[PDB]
Amino acid sequence: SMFLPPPECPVFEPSWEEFADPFAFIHKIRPIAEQTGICKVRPPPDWQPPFACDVDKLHFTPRIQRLNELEAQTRVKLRDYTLRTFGEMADAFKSDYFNMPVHMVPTELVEKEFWRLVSTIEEDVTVEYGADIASKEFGSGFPVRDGIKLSPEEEEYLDSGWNLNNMPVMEQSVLAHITADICGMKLPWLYVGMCFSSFCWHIEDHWSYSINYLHWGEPKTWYGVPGYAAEQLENVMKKLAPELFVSQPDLLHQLVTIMNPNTLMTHEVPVYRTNQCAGEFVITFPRAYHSGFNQGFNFAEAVNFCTVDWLPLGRQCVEHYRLLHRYCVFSHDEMICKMASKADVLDVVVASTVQKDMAIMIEDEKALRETVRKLGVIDSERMDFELLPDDERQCVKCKTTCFMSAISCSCKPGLLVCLHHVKELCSCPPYKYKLRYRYTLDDLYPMMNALKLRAES
Numbered sequence: 001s002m003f004l005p006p007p008e009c010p011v012f013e014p015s016w017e018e019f020a021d022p023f024a025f026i027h028k029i030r031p032i033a034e035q036t037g038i039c040k041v042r043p044p045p046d047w048q049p050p051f052a053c054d055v056d057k058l059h060f061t062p063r064i065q066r067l068n069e070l071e072a073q074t075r076v077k078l079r080d081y082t083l084r085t086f087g088e089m090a091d092a093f094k095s096d097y098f099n100m101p102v103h104m105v106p107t108e109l110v111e112k113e114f115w116r117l118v119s120t121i122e123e124d125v126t127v128e129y130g131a132d133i134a135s136k137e138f139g140s141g142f143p144v145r146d147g148i149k150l151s152p153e154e155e156e157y158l159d160s161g162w163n164l165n166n167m168p169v170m171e172q173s174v175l176a177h178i179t180a181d182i183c184g185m186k187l188p189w190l191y192v193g194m195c196f197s198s199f200c201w202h203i204e205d206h207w208s209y210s211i212n213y214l215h216w217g218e219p220k221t222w223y224g225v226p227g228y229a230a231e232q233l234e235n236v237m238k239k240l241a242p243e244l245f246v247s248q249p250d251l252l253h254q255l256v257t258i259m260n261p262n263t264l265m266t267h268e269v270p271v272y273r274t275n276q277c278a279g280e281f282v283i284t285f286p287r288a289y290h291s292g293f294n295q296g297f298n299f300a301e302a303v304n305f306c307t308v309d310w311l312p313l314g315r316q317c318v319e320h321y322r323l324l325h326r327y328c329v330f331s332h333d334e335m336i337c338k339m340a341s342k343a344d345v346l347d348v349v350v351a352s353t354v355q356k357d358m359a360i361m362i363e364d365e366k367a368l369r370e371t372v373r374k375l376g377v378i379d380s381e382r383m384d385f386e387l388l389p390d391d392e393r394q395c396v397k398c399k400t401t402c403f404m405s406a407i408s409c410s411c412k413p414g415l416l417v418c419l420h421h422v423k424e425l426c427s428c429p430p431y432k433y434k435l436r437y438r439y440t441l442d443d444l445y446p447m448m449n450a451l452k453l454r455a456e457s
């Protein structure tokens with residue numbers, strides 16, 4: 001009645017042995033957690049990263065949020081509070097809203113109340129929050145390196161796999177090997193919460209994993225949907241709020257919304273919940289929709305990552321983006337080829353999985369090139385796509401980031417289409433077209449062979 005909490009998501013308590021390697025651990029829980037989309041990970045009791053900061057010297061620009069269900073909000077873009085003044089505002093808000101000591105409101109009640117107030121148009125509650133990548137004004141909650149002497153305890157956690165700053169540059173996240181500037185994806189985001197500040201339903205760019213660590217404060221309440229129910233959820237969303245689905249003019253205009261999990265559960269979409277408390281991790285799996293809100297003043301840090309498991313999903317995702325005409329954050333094929341070009345220094349399990357994705361890439365590329373030849377495109381020239389800014393190598397039709405090949409035409413200088421959209425570039429006859437390609441098929445097979453040798457198969 002009014003609000004029925006979804007079932008709880010898995011909670012894992014790894015021993016220090018299991019916890020040592022995050023990628024091994026994530027792989028182990030994967031068959032369980034991917035059925036629920038999110039899961040929680042409680043570190044061993046003696047895993048306490050040192051959090052220390054001056055609350056008066058950390059400052060940030062607050063973002064403002066209206067709280068209406070099904071109302072469109074924009075995904076956060078890449079006034080001023082200090083952490084102390086925000087904290088004071090946030091505690092006062094919650095304390096005044098409930099007329100209770102700010103830390104005495106039951107989590108059950110805030111949740112019930114959150115879903116009441118987002119559904120009631122008579123109640124125009126607005127809240128504020130912080131969201132940004134680390135900077136000089138507000139840095140990572142985890143120990144980093146620079147011109148400040150670290151204690152032996154901080155040095156212990158400097159190189160932890162669970163220090164989210166390390167997640168990008170680690171040798172089991174294929175995002176590490178990307179040389180392209182994708183700071184939005186590789187760098188951790190910092191989130192300063194207050195009561196009811198919320199993140200709308202979304203999945204991660206390129207269907208990556210995400211991992212969220214609650215450093216300090218009141219809990220963060222989560223809802224998660226498993227990857228297999230993604231399109232099921234999207235169907236429901238289109239039905240009740242189709243306005244969210246009109247084509248986005250940019251990646252800076254992605255529309256997302258708050259929507260009651262009971263509404264989803266009513267339409268047979270599986271939904272799980274959890275309250276993430278301070279010192280706990282939440283992990284989201286590929287294409288797992290998730291949303292949530294903060295119980296009160298808190299501080300979280302989150303980062304994207306991609307394991308070898310993800311590679312085939314990454315390819316499927318870029319295909320899905322093409323159908324939707326959605327912009328890519330990076331070129332997936334460019335990443336695969338970058339890794340192939342470094343086959344000798346690759347982890348051997350990585351090499352093996354990259355090899356299989358590369359084989360699919362090459363076979364798809366072979367067929368596409370045969371098709372455009374049959375359309376009468378004859379002229380061709382090698383082109384170093386990776387040197388072009390992304391906005392200079394998107395298919396004018398489906399907006400995909402080109403890398404393996406594209407079609408150009410002297411009639412339309414600087415414009416390109418991917419090989420799926422040869423007809424869409426201009427009205428000139430195809431013999432005026434040019435296939436621009438990064439590699440010949442003859443360059444590609446040896447790159448794939450290097451992977452095979454490194455995989456030792």
Ligand SMILES: Cc1cccc2c1[C@@H](N)C(=O)N2
Nearest residue numbers: 076129131191193198199300
């Ligand atoms: C504010 C915001 C936006 C998008 C994702 C996330 C947040 C956070 N409050 C959080 O923890 N994840």
Ligand SMILES: [Cl-]
Nearest residue numbers: 067117120123
């Ligand atoms: Cl409202």
Ligand SMILES: [Mn+2]
Nearest residue numbers: 091102103104
């Ligand atoms: Mn308190």
Ligand SMILES: [Mn+2]
Nearest residue numbers: 202203204210
């Ligand atoms: Mn997310």
Ligand SMILES: [Zn+2]
Nearest residue numbers: 395398418421
């Ligand atoms: Zn295209």
